[PDB]
């Protein structure tokens, strides 16, 4: 695998992470590779004696672009974790029980636990210590992404069929076919698995 | 996702330039090698690199083949005749705006090219407006097909997603209110 391939995968990951309403499986491996590449190029430029020439400016502008992509990805994921930290831990544990790929990396999980404790302290000092003994439990809201729509484009050849709710009869469901160049306005939970597998690009 | 990030993604496309400087080795970018440069001999580099050289007077930009006036007229003819959105080159509007912003000296038949691009944008905008208005009268489905939509066109039209999410709650309330 080349760094030229790693950067191309990272850009598609960044676009999907911005568009999706909830948390995708983590891709901090590519982030770590690209940060190491930035540091290597910086030290290599630092060994040069002459810097007022075209090559150094071209290299520095490319490092600017890669730094923007990685920073914006990490900022989006932290802003998603801050909205509901306990639910993120719960979903990560459920994916581990199902035997699927990781939702959070180790540092992300550590951040989530420490933020959850820091958020609990404020409520306990302000309200919950004054409550009667039955009312001292900490509230945690349920998930909220039930009726969210997305614009989605199909890229893979053999995606197959998708099921969506039936607004004429909400007891049942309707089946759709996804031909391999199409764009759709569709609920997110129908295309969730294909977005994880990389067969669909969100717009 | 917004228009600045759309332009940022559009910057990764490749375009052909003619340098006036010269250099011996290649340049080993993380996105891959681009050099070497010889004066007066064209070669292909990314669009962001091309604009960076053009600002420093180090090259001349060669416009894409789809900026020919005949090709733009073909695109306008197909867009007029088809009921849905016609197919376009990748990042069509973004690359057009970037090149008119930074390299309009090298475009040929600039005013005619500019007017044809504005015509194409106007009637694609009207098609998207009519499709969204006709969708929002629906109650029977929560699905639509929008083939050949561009990324910036999708980015400008995110009110429909919120409107559909609001409609789904009232539909679900009626279904739960149906007696048994």
């Amino acid at each position: 695998t080349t760094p030229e391939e790693v950067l191309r995968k990272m850009t598609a990951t960044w676009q999907n992470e911005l568009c999706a309403p909830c948390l995708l499986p983590t891709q901090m491996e590519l982030v770590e590779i690209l940060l190491d590449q930035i540091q290597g190029m910086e030290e290599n430029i630092g060994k040069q004696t002459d810097k007022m020439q075209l090559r150094i400016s071209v290299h520095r502008v490319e490092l600017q672009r890669i730094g923007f992509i990685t920073s914006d990805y990490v900022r989006c994921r932290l802003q998603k974790i801050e909205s509901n930290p306990h639910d993120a831990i719960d979903q990560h544990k459920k994916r581990k029980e199902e035997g699927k790929s990781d939702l959070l990396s180790e540092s992300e999980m550590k951040f989530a636990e420490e933020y959850a404790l820091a958020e609990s302290n404020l409520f306990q000092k302000t309200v919950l210590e004054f409550m009667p003994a039955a009312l001292k439990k900490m509230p945690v809201p349920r998930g909220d992404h039930d009726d969210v729509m997305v614009y989605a484009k199909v890229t893979s050849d053999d995606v197959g069929n998708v099921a969506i709710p039936d607004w004429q009869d909400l007891n049942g469901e309707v089946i759709l076919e996804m031909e391999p160049e199409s764009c759709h306005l569709i609920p997110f939970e129908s295309v969730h698995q294909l977005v994880e597998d990389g067969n669909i690009q969100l717009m | 996702m917004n228009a600045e990030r759309c332009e940022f993604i559009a910057g990764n496309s490749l375009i052909e330039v003619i340098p006036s400087i010269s250099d011996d080795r290649p340049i080993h970018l993380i996105s891959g090698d681009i050099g070497p440069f010889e004066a007066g001999v064209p070669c292909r580099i990314p669009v962001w690199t091309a604009i960076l050289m053009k600002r420093k007077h180090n090259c001349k930009v060669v416009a894409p083949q789809w900026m020919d006036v005949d090709e733009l007229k073909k695109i306008l003819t197909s867009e007029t005749e088809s009921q849905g959105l016609a197919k376009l080159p990748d990042h069509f509007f973004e690359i057009s705006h970037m090149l008119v912003r930074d390299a309009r000296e090298d475009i040929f038949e600039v005013e005619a090219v500019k007017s044809l691009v504005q015509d194409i944008y106007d009637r694609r905008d009207a098609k998207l407006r009519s499709s969204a208005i006709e969708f929002l009268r629906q109650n029977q489905t929560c699905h639509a097909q929008l083939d050949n939509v561009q990324l910036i066109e999708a980015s400008s039209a995110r009110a429909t997603l919120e409107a559909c999410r609001q409609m789904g709650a009232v539909v679900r309330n009626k279904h739960e209110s149906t007696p048994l």
Binding site: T2, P3, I33, D36, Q37, M41, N44 | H28
Partner: peptide, 16 residues
């Protein structure tokens, strides 16, 4: 010697 990103990636593959 002329620097290249691929050698840096091979070194990091050996590290991790």
């Amino acid at each position: 010697e002329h620097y290249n990103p691929r050698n840096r990636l091979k070194t990091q593959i050996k590290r991790r």
